[PDB]
Amino acid sequence: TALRQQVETLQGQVQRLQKAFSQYKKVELFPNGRGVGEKIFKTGGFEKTFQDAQQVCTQAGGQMASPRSETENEALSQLVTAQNKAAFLSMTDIKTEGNFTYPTGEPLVYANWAPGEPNNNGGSSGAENCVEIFPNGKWNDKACGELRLVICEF
Amino acid sequence: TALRQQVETLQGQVQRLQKAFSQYKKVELFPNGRGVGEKIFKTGGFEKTFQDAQQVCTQAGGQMASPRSETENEALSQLVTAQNKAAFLSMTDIKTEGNFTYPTGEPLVYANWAPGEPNNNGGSSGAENCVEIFPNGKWNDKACGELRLVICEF
Amino acid sequence: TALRQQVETLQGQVQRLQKAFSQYKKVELFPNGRGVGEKIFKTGGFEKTFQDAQQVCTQAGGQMASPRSETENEALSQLVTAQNKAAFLSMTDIKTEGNFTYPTGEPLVYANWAPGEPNNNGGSSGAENCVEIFPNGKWNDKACGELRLVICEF
Ligand SMILES: *[C@@H]1O[C@H](CO)[C@@H](O[C@@H]2O[C@H](CO)[C@@H](O[C@@H]3O[C@H](CO[C@H]4O[C@H](CO)[C@@H](O)[C@H](O)[C@@H]4O[C@@H]4O[C@H](CO)[C@@H](O)[C@H](O)[C@H]4NC(C)=O)[C@@H](O)[C@H](O)[C@@H]3O)[C@H](O)[C@H]2NC(C)=O)[C@H](O)[C@H]1NC(C)=O
Ligand SMILES: *[C@@H]1O[C@H](CO)[C@@H](O[C@@H]2O[C@H](CO)[C@@H](O[C@@H]3O[C@H](CO[C@H]4O[C@H](CO)[C@@H](O)[C@H](O)[C@@H]4O[C@@H]4O[C@H](CO)[C@@H](O)[C@H](O)[C@H]4NC(C)=O)[C@@H](O)[C@H](O)[C@@H]3O)[C@H](O)[C@H]2NC(C)=O)[C@H](O)[C@H]1NC(C)=O
Ligand SMILES: *[C@@H]1O[C@H](CO)[C@@H](O[C@@H]2O[C@H](CO)[C@@H](O[C@@H]3O[C@H](CO[C@H]4O[C@H](CO)[C@@H](O)[C@H](O)[C@@H]4O[C@@H]4O[C@H](CO)[C@@H](O)[C@H](O)[C@H]4NC(C)=O)[C@@H](O)[C@H](O)[C@@H]3O)[C@H](O)[C@H]2NC(C)=O)[C@H](O)[C@H]1NC(C)=O
Ligand SMILES: [Ca+2]
Ligand SMILES: [Ca+2]
Ligand SMILES: [Ca+2]
Ligand SMILES: [Ca+2]
Ligand SMILES: [Ca+2]
Ligand SMILES: [Ca+2]
């Protein structure tokens, strides 16, 4: 009976927590984050080389963005559009040229290459083994040593 | 009895959640957010026309700021003061000139017009049917096509 | 029995809350925050005098940073490194020259003074009674009237 009073009080605390949490997720993601399913993408609003971006995302507790669907890709395109800066994705063809994989090593389940890309031609930058996403959502292979918007996936 | 052990464990988890949540609300609102009652105002730190600001706030899961009291208005004034940029509020007199309403269509329950305002005179901008808030908290009717600080209400 | 169903449902809600909360802490701290133990440090990304920084942190619900260990100090150094701007710490020697204390008045349990510091010589700024932290983590006594990165502790 007293136990009953305790779980009804827990129900009220839990529901208030859920309400307040729904609100603070929306507050937190405004404006530099987007949620898709269980994933959250968030930009730090600065640019780094691919290598430094990788360290930054891991150190923060996440990883670089691996868009596995149109919906996830659109969310990233929304972030780079707002920031007006193209962002590095997680994927590279470093192990095998022309074959872009996630950092786990599996092949892409989704791809949105711009016309003509990937082309592995960064001019004076040499080969292009990383991937940038444009405001329109399209992808281009870019040299990993370039500076691009950092977006992390959590 | 075992059930008793389970709710006492729930009590501990709930309380730790409440403690950590109180802290992460303060962390999140620092420095671009303010809480007042059940409302949270947060600025994105960029400027947009009223129309674009409306889309941005809705898309993010909220709406534009509708200050219904002195306390809510002060919180907004704190945000525009920090950003040093005047912000659009939610209210317009688009439906009826001189009669400012919330987006629901109800009349203001609170108003803080600067001296002489509203005046519906944006010079070359034409009529003024939206509302900007100044660092001092005072209001001026401004053309909706101007760019002003975006603050959203959640 | 029905009570049993209610606490098992609470267990599921609590665990989902804990999972989502772990994720939104990491999202929130990226990139301007760091957690150490029960503390969270977060920079606002602007500069203020020591006096104004104190007001800002208190008003936000926290206080200025009081690094009490190497780990806490490193977290601050990570924030000023990212921002490329030295930050004020909480400690002053205002009450007694050469004796730096926390705002509670207790002496430092940890210190990381740069070589030669503290020296109480701000040139035209006069005496130096506050403390700045550099990107390398080292400390220098600086005049309290200077503008430095604002980091708050929550
Ligand atoms: C770029 O480089 C990568 C790395 O080598 C290559 O990745 C491979 O892509 C192929 C083609 O789609 C893919 O094969 C398909 O796998 C599907 C899923 O089932 C497979 O994995 C499960 C485990 O999750 C196994 O239990 C299944 O039996 C399948 O096992 C695969 O079998 C093949 C031999 O038939 C073997 O070569 C693979 O190593 C092995 N994979 C794994 C993970 O065990 C199937 O439904 C479908 O029918 C295909 O078999 C394969 O999984 C990828 N390999 C790896 C290592 O991930 C790309 O081929 C290459 N090129 C491109 C264009 O991306
Ligand atoms: C600017 O433009 C707007 C839109 O037309 C006008 O808004 C109206 O403001 C008036 C004046 O304050 C306001 O009337 C007061 O309403 C108070 C609340 O009670 C009313 O609403 C409840 C429901 O919440 C009803 O159950 C009550 O019976 C009241 O109903 C109102 O009755 C009047 C006729 O007497 C009718 O014209 C209204 O449409 C109707 N409102 C609603 C929502 O049902 C009362 O305590 C108080 O005594 C006043 O009656 C009225 O509610 C506003 N109308 C709307 C559509 O929201 C402004 O008049 C106009 N000018 C300014 C200066 O803002
Ligand atoms: C800069 O300015 C400050 C402010 O005056 C001075 O702070 C003092 O530092 C000393 C030296 O370390 C420190 O004394 C040590 O305290 C340790 C902890 O135990 C003391 O506090 C507990 C309560 O938490 C008491 O129950 C203990 O009995 C100790 O009490 C202290 O006793 C001394 C007399 O023996 C007395 O003068 C203190 O006021 C008193 N402190 C308190 C808080 O009650 C001990 O383990 C250790 O053996 C030392 O005694 C002392 O606590 C600090 N005082 C204050 C007010 O915080 C610095 O000396 C000065 N210089 C520097 C270099 O920082
Ligand atoms: Ca390549
Ligand atoms: Ca290319
Ligand atoms: Ca008007
Ligand atoms: Ca006006
Ligand atoms: Ca001094
Ligand atoms: Ca000095």
XYZ file of C-alpha atoms and ligand atoms in Angstrom:
660
model
C 0.000 0.000 0.000
C 2.743 2.424 0.973
C 4.655 0.759 -1.858
C 1.772 1.734 -4.134
C 2.133 5.368 -3.108
C 5.834 5.168 -3.935
C 5.369 3.921 -7.524
C 2.607 6.450 -8.240
C 5.021 9.118 -7.099
C 7.640 7.544 -9.398
C 5.151 7.646 -12.297
C 4.719 11.390 -11.788
C 8.460 12.075 -11.562
C 9.144 9.933 -14.636
C 6.488 11.652 -16.722
C 7.705 15.116 -15.683
C 11.229 14.019 -16.573
C 10.020 12.803 -20.001
C 8.205 16.091 -20.671
C 11.167 18.224 -19.650
C 13.552 16.005 -21.611
C 11.541 16.278 -24.843
C 11.801 20.070 -24.486
C 15.525 20.162 -23.695
C 16.344 17.922 -26.681
C 14.660 20.443 -28.996
C 16.418 23.306 -27.207
C 19.836 21.612 -27.488
C 19.482 20.770 -31.201
C 18.479 24.344 -32.007
C 20.157 25.318 -34.220
C 23.287 23.217 -34.733
C 21.841 19.746 -34.312
C 19.427 17.372 -36.038
C 17.986 14.086 -34.774
C 17.212 11.128 -37.052
C 16.080 7.914 -35.435
C 18.524 7.055 -32.677
C 21.232 9.253 -34.227
C 22.045 12.873 -33.442
C 24.210 14.948 -35.784
C 25.710 18.145 -34.453
C 28.148 20.581 -36.015
C 30.784 22.342 -33.938
C 30.777 25.244 -36.378
C 34.519 25.061 -37.095
C 36.597 23.519 -39.887
C 39.303 20.879 -39.567
C 41.192 18.414 -41.736
C 39.624 14.984 -41.918
C 42.236 13.567 -39.524
C 41.684 16.257 -36.883
C 37.901 16.030 -37.334
C 38.065 12.299 -36.603
C 39.943 12.940 -33.340
C 37.555 15.713 -32.334
C 34.422 13.542 -32.807
C 35.894 10.503 -31.032
C 37.245 12.582 -28.156
C 33.787 14.145 -27.754
C 32.323 10.652 -27.398
C 30.963 10.154 -30.901
C 32.233 9.685 -34.464
C 32.037 11.403 -37.841
C 28.735 11.355 -39.745
C 27.841 8.161 -41.601
C 24.585 8.944 -43.453
C 22.961 5.596 -44.245
C 19.757 6.957 -45.746
C 18.226 9.900 -47.557
C 16.750 11.195 -44.299
C 20.092 11.135 -42.511
C 21.732 12.794 -45.525
C 19.135 15.570 -45.635
C 19.780 16.304 -41.949
C 23.478 16.774 -42.696
C 22.685 18.939 -45.713
C 20.568 21.116 -43.409
C 23.570 21.638 -41.138
C 26.038 22.529 -43.890
C 23.412 24.793 -45.509
C 22.980 26.758 -42.271
C 26.742 26.991 -41.753
C 27.307 27.668 -45.477
C 30.300 25.313 -45.310
C 30.736 21.820 -46.796
C 31.449 19.071 -44.243
C 33.593 15.939 -44.139
C 31.681 12.660 -43.872
C 33.063 9.568 -42.129
C 33.806 7.578 -45.276
C 37.112 7.138 -47.137
C 38.539 5.060 -49.991
C 41.967 4.987 -48.332
C 42.156 1.198 -48.135
C 40.986 0.605 -51.721
C 40.837 3.365 -54.336
C 37.328 3.943 -55.696
C 35.741 1.850 -52.961
C 34.386 4.065 -50.208
C 33.749 2.432 -46.840
C 32.574 3.446 -43.369
C 35.199 3.518 -40.597
C 34.090 -0.028 -39.721
C 35.218 -1.088 -43.191
C 31.787 -2.023 -44.586
C 30.671 -0.605 -47.962
C 28.133 2.239 -48.251
C 24.469 1.252 -47.881
C 23.647 4.704 -49.264
C 25.414 7.091 -51.640
C 24.598 10.511 -53.120
C 27.492 11.390 -55.435
C 27.347 14.619 -57.409
C 27.572 14.216 -61.191
C 31.077 13.149 -62.262
C 32.175 12.234 -58.736
C 34.072 10.557 -57.196
C 37.010 11.520 -59.445
C 40.107 11.323 -57.187
C 41.433 14.575 -58.644
C 42.148 17.338 -56.116
C 44.450 19.239 -58.449
C 47.459 20.372 -56.435
C 46.054 18.506 -53.386
C 46.754 15.194 -55.114
C 44.437 12.231 -54.599
C 40.986 12.588 -53.031
C 40.164 9.938 -50.466
C 37.655 11.630 -48.190
C 34.145 12.898 -48.803
C 32.535 16.332 -48.506
C 28.802 16.995 -48.474
C 27.398 20.137 -50.171
C 24.386 22.272 -49.122
C 22.314 20.492 -51.774
C 23.202 17.199 -50.093
C 25.393 15.979 -52.979
C 28.801 14.342 -52.324
C 32.281 15.050 -53.712
C 35.515 13.198 -53.006
C 37.949 15.711 -51.553
C 41.561 15.543 -50.390
C 41.692 14.529 -46.720
C 44.129 17.335 -45.923
C 41.613 20.086 -46.719
C 39.689 21.976 -44.015
C 35.958 21.302 -43.944
C 33.008 21.756 -41.540
C 33.149 19.344 -38.607
C 29.865 17.489 -37.983
C 29.816 14.699 -35.398
C 27.383 11.822 -35.022
C 26.192 10.745 -31.554
C 9.720 -7.728 -1.018
C 11.862 -8.122 -4.116
C 9.418 -5.632 -5.623
C 10.341 -3.285 -2.780
C 14.013 -3.552 -3.693
C 13.120 -2.683 -7.279
C 11.280 0.569 -6.452
C 13.995 1.704 -4.028
C 16.454 1.185 -6.843
C 14.100 3.192 -9.092
C 13.996 5.985 -6.484
C 17.790 6.225 -6.599
C 17.955 6.240 -10.405
C 15.180 8.840 -10.618
C 16.828 11.156 -8.112
C 20.213 10.866 -9.848
C 18.464 11.611 -13.134
C 16.793 14.693 -11.582
C 20.117 15.959 -10.201
C 21.954 15.466 -13.480
C 19.073 17.005 -15.426
C 19.001 20.171 -13.297
C 22.712 20.589 -14.094
C 22.414 19.932 -17.834
C 19.541 22.430 -18.172
C 21.781 25.156 -16.725
C 24.651 24.025 -18.955
C 22.456 24.052 -22.087
C 20.968 27.511 -21.417
C 24.425 28.990 -20.871
C 24.695 31.397 -22.543
C 22.102 31.562 -25.322
C 19.027 30.416 -23.438
C 16.739 31.565 -20.631
C 14.007 29.631 -18.824
C 10.807 31.248 -17.528
C 8.168 28.991 -16.056
C 7.517 26.182 -18.508
C 8.954 28.213 -21.402
C 12.500 28.191 -22.746
C 13.743 30.959 -25.042
C 16.885 30.336 -27.038
C 18.589 32.419 -29.697
C 20.318 30.809 -32.660
C 22.660 33.779 -32.916
C 21.799 34.545 -36.553
C 19.458 37.026 -38.243
C 16.566 36.255 -40.575
C 13.479 37.936 -41.985
C 10.344 37.385 -39.954
C 9.056 34.827 -42.475
C 12.259 32.764 -42.444
C 12.501 33.059 -38.646
C 9.000 31.601 -38.336
C 9.983 28.583 -40.462
C 13.216 28.090 -38.535
C 11.473 28.034 -35.113
C 8.657 25.727 -36.249
C 11.037 23.363 -38.029
C 13.133 23.190 -34.846
C 10.027 22.102 -32.938
C 9.060 25.397 -31.332
C 7.727 28.826 -32.328
C 8.766 32.472 -32.184
C 8.829 34.239 -28.807
C 5.499 35.393 -27.382
C 6.372 37.276 -24.168
C 3.207 37.338 -22.059
C 4.700 38.994 -18.994
C 7.426 41.317 -17.784
C 9.530 38.347 -16.681
C 9.334 36.673 -20.077
C 10.119 40.001 -21.761
C 13.167 40.596 -19.566
C 14.502 37.150 -20.507
C 14.276 38.074 -24.188
C 15.905 41.442 -23.535
C 18.772 39.565 -21.867
C 19.283 37.526 -25.032
C 19.254 40.465 -27.444
C 21.517 42.434 -25.069
C 24.115 39.645 -25.089
C 23.896 39.285 -28.870
C 23.746 43.083 -29.317
C 21.059 42.528 -31.962
C 17.319 43.295 -31.833
C 15.044 40.263 -32.302
C 11.715 39.590 -33.998
C 8.864 38.621 -31.672
C 6.003 36.332 -32.711
C 3.352 39.035 -32.999
C 2.083 40.857 -36.106
C -0.695 43.274 -37.076
C -0.942 41.727 -40.547
C -4.606 40.779 -40.226
C -5.709 44.142 -38.789
C -3.518 47.252 -38.877
C -2.713 48.606 -35.411
C -3.980 45.465 -33.705
C -1.099 43.176 -32.820
C -1.935 39.534 -32.151
C -0.106 36.306 -31.319
C 0.121 33.676 -34.078
C -2.987 32.078 -32.543
C -4.854 35.295 -33.322
C -5.534 36.381 -29.724
C -4.653 39.942 -28.629
C -1.581 40.727 -26.494
C -1.934 40.069 -22.754
C 1.265 42.093 -22.339
C 2.861 44.946 -24.283
C 6.010 47.058 -23.863
C 5.992 49.579 -26.719
C 8.761 52.156 -26.910
C 7.602 55.784 -26.868
C 5.849 56.713 -30.130
C 5.488 53.106 -31.284
C 3.885 51.312 -33.015
C 3.955 53.786 -35.930
C 3.753 51.619 -39.089
C 6.432 53.732 -40.767
C 9.500 51.830 -41.992
C 10.555 54.556 -44.401
C 11.609 52.891 -47.643
C 10.596 49.494 -46.165
C 6.945 50.542 -46.308
C 4.508 49.382 -43.639
C 5.661 47.826 -40.361
C 3.708 44.760 -39.326
C 6.157 42.803 -37.202
C 7.778 43.564 -33.870
C 11.401 43.918 -32.766
C 12.593 43.920 -29.167
C 15.514 46.174 -28.115
C 18.228 45.494 -25.487
C 16.286 47.679 -23.047
C 13.290 45.397 -23.567
C 11.226 48.037 -25.407
C 9.271 47.159 -28.589
C 9.182 48.753 -32.052
C 7.052 47.777 -35.035
C 9.419 46.922 -37.867
C 8.957 45.846 -41.481
C 8.668 42.053 -41.673
C 11.191 41.899 -44.512
C 14.070 43.162 -42.357
C 16.709 40.842 -40.862
C 16.612 40.538 -37.084
C 17.948 38.195 -34.360
C 16.158 34.843 -34.331
C 14.958 33.773 -30.863
C 12.762 30.681 -30.573
C 10.397 29.671 -27.794
C 10.199 26.027 -26.659
C 0.613 -8.019 -9.514
C -0.683 -5.007 -11.408
C 1.794 -3.097 -9.249
C 4.490 -5.386 -10.640
C 3.520 -4.448 -14.185
C 3.795 -0.785 -13.224
C 7.379 -0.993 -11.896
C 8.556 -3.068 -14.869
C 7.148 -0.348 -17.076
C 8.999 2.193 -14.899
C 12.231 0.196 -15.323
C 11.890 0.458 -19.101
C 11.141 4.193 -19.058
C 14.024 4.848 -16.658
C 16.519 2.902 -18.743
C 15.408 4.634 -21.955
C 15.746 7.955 -20.148
C 19.280 7.009 -19.002
C 20.294 5.999 -22.539
C 18.911 9.160 -24.108
C 20.444 11.297 -21.363
C 23.940 9.844 -21.843
C 23.651 10.808 -25.527
C 22.330 14.331 -24.936
C 25.105 15.086 -22.419
C 27.706 14.275 -25.088
C 25.757 16.308 -27.648
C 25.493 19.323 -25.308
C 29.195 19.320 -24.348
C 30.233 19.174 -28.000
C 32.204 21.301 -28.505
C 32.200 23.986 -25.810
C 31.902 21.830 -22.716
C 33.895 19.250 -20.765
C 32.767 17.020 -17.897
C 35.053 15.989 -15.025
C 33.533 14.024 -12.186
C 30.427 15.846 -11.022
C 31.625 19.126 -12.563
C 30.827 20.532 -15.993
C 32.885 23.368 -17.475
C 31.435 25.282 -20.388
C 32.691 28.349 -22.213
C 30.301 30.975 -23.539
C 32.792 31.883 -26.249
C 32.953 35.575 -25.302
C 35.372 37.665 -23.234
C 34.591 39.717 -20.139
C 36.396 41.353 -17.239
C 36.712 39.169 -14.174
C 33.927 41.091 -12.411
C 31.466 40.733 -15.298
C 32.456 37.079 -15.787
C 31.610 36.390 -12.141
C 28.127 37.893 -12.583
C 27.554 35.994 -15.819
C 28.418 32.585 -14.276
C 26.368 33.160 -11.111
C 23.383 34.493 -13.043
C 23.530 31.397 -15.268
C 23.296 29.228 -12.152
C 26.946 28.289 -11.735
C 30.273 29.916 -10.833
C 33.686 30.533 -12.368
C 36.049 27.582 -12.858
C 37.928 26.329 -9.802
C 40.254 23.581 -11.100
C 41.184 21.444 -8.094
C 43.170 18.814 -9.967
C 45.262 18.167 -13.048
C 42.290 16.548 -14.782
C 40.034 19.533 -14.171
C 42.821 21.870 -15.312
C 43.382 19.921 -18.529
C 39.662 20.188 -19.325
C 39.875 23.972 -19.025
C 43.033 24.051 -21.134
C 41.120 22.118 -23.804
C 38.451 24.822 -23.856
C 40.838 27.773 -24.097
C 42.882 25.901 -26.736
C 39.795 25.432 -28.923
C 38.742 29.056 -28.448
C 42.361 30.251 -28.796
C 41.698 32.659 -25.917
C 43.011 32.586 -22.330
C 40.309 32.378 -19.639
C 39.810 33.815 -16.161
C 39.737 31.267 -13.336
C 37.729 31.749 -10.135
C 40.681 32.502 -7.868
C 42.029 35.876 -6.692
C 44.588 37.236 -4.223
C 42.448 40.319 -3.575
C 42.124 39.716 0.161
C 45.825 38.954 0.712
C 48.507 39.721 -1.877
C 50.377 36.620 -3.050
C 47.847 34.286 -1.460
C 45.380 33.038 -4.044
C 42.098 31.630 -2.754
C 38.863 30.218 -4.167
C 35.742 32.399 -3.879
C 34.942 30.492 -0.670
C 38.182 31.850 0.778
C 40.035 28.526 1.104
C 43.574 28.190 -0.316
C 44.304 26.338 -3.580
C 44.445 22.535 -3.345
C 46.025 22.619 -6.810
C 48.181 25.137 -8.673
C 49.855 25.233 -12.100
C 51.748 28.535 -12.271
C 53.807 29.312 -15.352
C 57.504 29.968 -14.706
C 58.025 33.301 -12.920
C 54.354 33.699 -12.004
C 52.510 34.992 -10.078
C 54.333 38.344 -10.326
C 51.645 40.998 -9.655
C 52.980 43.137 -12.502
C 50.450 44.037 -15.208
C 52.473 46.971 -16.493
C 50.074 49.841 -17.129
C 47.213 47.686 -15.743
C 48.733 47.938 -12.268
C 48.481 45.026 -9.845
C 47.441 41.535 -10.952
C 44.953 39.855 -8.658
C 43.111 37.448 -10.928
C 44.262 34.381 -12.819
C 44.294 33.467 -16.511
C 44.823 29.974 -17.888
C 46.789 29.474 -21.145
C 46.246 26.836 -23.880
C 49.123 24.833 -22.393
C 47.243 24.804 -19.089
C 49.747 27.081 -17.308
C 48.560 29.969 -15.079
C 49.445 33.678 -15.018
C 48.228 36.346 -12.614
C 46.504 39.012 -14.683
C 44.824 42.323 -13.879
C 41.149 41.743 -13.063
C 40.081 44.560 -15.380
C 41.307 42.780 -18.520
C 38.964 40.921 -20.894
C 39.417 37.157 -20.964
C 37.481 34.056 -22.115
C 34.495 33.308 -19.886
C 34.306 29.665 -18.743
C 31.682 28.704 -16.163
C 31.586 25.716 -13.839
C 28.301 23.869 -13.206
C 34.361 -2.504 -51.532
O 35.095 -3.133 -50.496
C 34.324 -3.930 -49.610
C 35.257 -4.620 -48.605
O 35.893 -5.750 -49.171
C 33.395 -4.951 -50.296
O 32.350 -5.206 -49.366
C 31.538 -6.365 -49.673
O 30.409 -6.065 -50.474
C 29.754 -7.242 -50.881
C 28.819 -6.949 -52.054
O 27.588 -6.440 -51.593
C 29.062 -7.855 -49.661
O 28.457 -9.069 -50.031
C 27.049 -9.084 -49.748
O 26.790 -9.368 -48.391
C 25.417 -9.458 -48.063
C 25.246 -9.699 -46.555
O 25.633 -11.004 -46.154
C 27.069 -11.163 -46.033
O 27.504 -10.852 -44.721
C 26.884 -11.657 -43.730
C 27.300 -11.181 -42.339
O 26.666 -9.952 -42.053
C 27.247 -13.124 -43.987
O 26.758 -13.978 -42.964
C 26.742 -13.514 -45.379
O 27.039 -14.857 -45.689
C 27.454 -12.607 -46.366
O 28.836 -12.902 -46.220
C 29.682 -12.410 -47.287
O 29.935 -13.423 -48.249
C 30.845 -13.101 -49.286
C 30.991 -14.323 -50.187
O 29.743 -14.633 -50.762
C 32.203 -12.692 -48.723
O 33.071 -12.273 -49.759
C 32.052 -11.566 -47.712
O 33.303 -11.363 -47.087
C 30.979 -11.875 -46.666
N 30.698 -10.697 -45.859
C 30.622 -10.743 -44.529
C 30.447 -9.431 -43.821
O 30.680 -11.791 -43.886
C 24.716 -10.543 -48.886
O 23.324 -10.487 -48.681
C 24.963 -10.349 -50.374
O 24.479 -11.474 -51.075
C 26.451 -10.160 -50.648
O 27.150 -11.371 -50.438
C 30.092 -8.170 -48.580
O 29.454 -8.460 -47.355
C 31.101 -7.039 -48.369
N 32.258 -7.562 -47.668
C 32.658 -7.056 -46.505
C 34.003 -7.504 -46.007
O 31.978 -6.260 -45.859
C 32.807 -4.495 -51.644
O 32.530 -5.610 -52.468
C 33.720 -3.556 -52.437
N 32.997 -2.957 -53.557
C 31.960 -2.112 -53.461
C 31.292 -1.740 -54.751
O 31.532 -1.632 -52.410
C -7.725 43.156 -31.821
O -8.240 42.035 -32.518
C -8.729 40.987 -31.695
C -9.339 39.890 -32.579
O -10.637 40.234 -33.021
C -9.719 41.430 -30.598
O -9.633 40.439 -29.581
C -10.699 40.487 -28.603
O -10.399 41.300 -27.483
C -11.525 41.446 -26.652
C -11.333 42.628 -25.702
O -10.571 42.246 -24.580
C -11.782 40.110 -25.950
O -12.943 40.213 -25.165
C -12.699 39.895 -23.786
O -12.672 38.502 -23.565
C -12.496 38.126 -22.213
C -12.412 36.597 -22.094
O -13.656 35.953 -22.320
C -13.996 35.841 -23.725
O -13.502 34.630 -24.270
C -14.000 33.481 -23.601
C -13.328 32.226 -24.154
O -11.988 32.174 -23.711
C -15.526 33.449 -23.745
O -16.085 32.263 -23.200
C -16.102 34.721 -23.115
O -17.508 34.762 -23.207
C -15.517 35.887 -23.889
O -15.976 35.723 -25.223
C -15.829 36.889 -26.069
O -17.035 37.635 -26.127
C -17.057 38.739 -27.015
C -18.439 39.381 -26.942
O -18.671 39.848 -25.633
C -16.749 38.306 -28.445
O -16.669 39.428 -29.303
C -15.437 37.538 -28.506
O -15.301 36.999 -29.805
C -15.378 36.423 -27.460
N -14.038 35.861 -27.388
C -13.812 34.547 -27.379
C -12.377 34.112 -27.425
O -14.712 33.709 -27.328
C -13.608 38.697 -21.326
O -13.310 38.469 -19.968
C -13.745 40.199 -21.514
O -14.901 40.647 -20.843
C -13.830 40.545 -22.997
O -15.066 40.115 -23.534
C -12.027 39.016 -26.985
O -11.978 37.741 -26.381
C -11.036 39.062 -28.149
N -11.575 38.303 -29.261
C -10.916 37.276 -29.790
C -11.449 36.733 -31.085
O -9.919 36.784 -29.262
C -9.452 42.825 -30.005
O -10.654 43.401 -29.533
C -8.829 43.814 -30.994
N -8.361 45.012 -30.299
C -7.371 45.059 -29.395
C -7.164 46.379 -28.714
O -6.639 44.116 -29.095
C 46.518 31.878 2.457
O 45.369 32.323 3.159
C 44.584 31.294 3.741
C 43.436 31.923 4.543
O 43.873 32.391 5.804
C 45.371 30.282 4.598
O 44.595 29.089 4.593
C 44.986 28.112 5.587
O 45.950 27.187 5.118
C 46.416 26.371 6.165
C 47.720 25.684 5.762
O 47.457 24.528 4.999
C 45.294 25.409 6.564
O 45.715 24.630 7.656
C 45.640 23.223 7.381
O 44.328 22.729 7.534
C 44.201 21.333 7.337
C 42.728 20.912 7.457
O 42.240 20.971 8.788
C 41.908 22.316 9.216
O 40.555 22.620 8.924
C 39.643 21.722 9.538
C 38.220 22.030 9.076
O 38.062 21.622 7.733
C 39.805 21.816 11.059
O 38.842 21.029 11.744
C 41.245 21.438 11.420
O 41.472 21.499 12.810
C 42.142 22.446 10.724
O 41.789 23.707 11.274
C 42.734 24.773 11.015
O 43.622 24.947 12.109
C 44.524 26.037 12.028
C 45.361 26.057 13.302
O 46.103 24.863 13.396
C 43.780 27.359 11.861
O 44.690 28.427 11.676
C 42.833 27.300 10.673
O 42.038 28.468 10.683
C 41.946 26.053 10.710
N 41.221 25.906 9.457
C 39.915 25.641 9.414
C 39.275 25.637 8.056
O 39.243 25.399 10.416
C 45.088 20.549 8.309
O 45.088 19.182 7.972
C 46.529 21.031 8.249
O 47.262 20.432 9.295
C 46.588 22.550 8.368
O 46.247 22.957 9.679
C 44.067 26.198 7.014
O 42.941 25.352 7.106
C 43.742 27.374 6.091
N 42.867 28.296 6.790
C 41.672 28.626 6.308
C 40.971 29.771 6.980
O 41.153 28.036 5.360
C 46.801 29.988 4.111
O 47.626 29.608 5.195
C 47.477 31.170 3.413
N 48.706 30.743 2.748
C 48.785 29.893 1.713
C 50.167 29.496 1.289
O 47.821 29.430 1.101
Ca 40.365 8.193 -53.806
Ca 36.326 15.110 -56.464
Ca 1.337 47.687 -39.101
Ca 8.117 51.568 -35.909
Ca 48.180 40.158 -6.726
Ca 51.581 37.991 -14.140
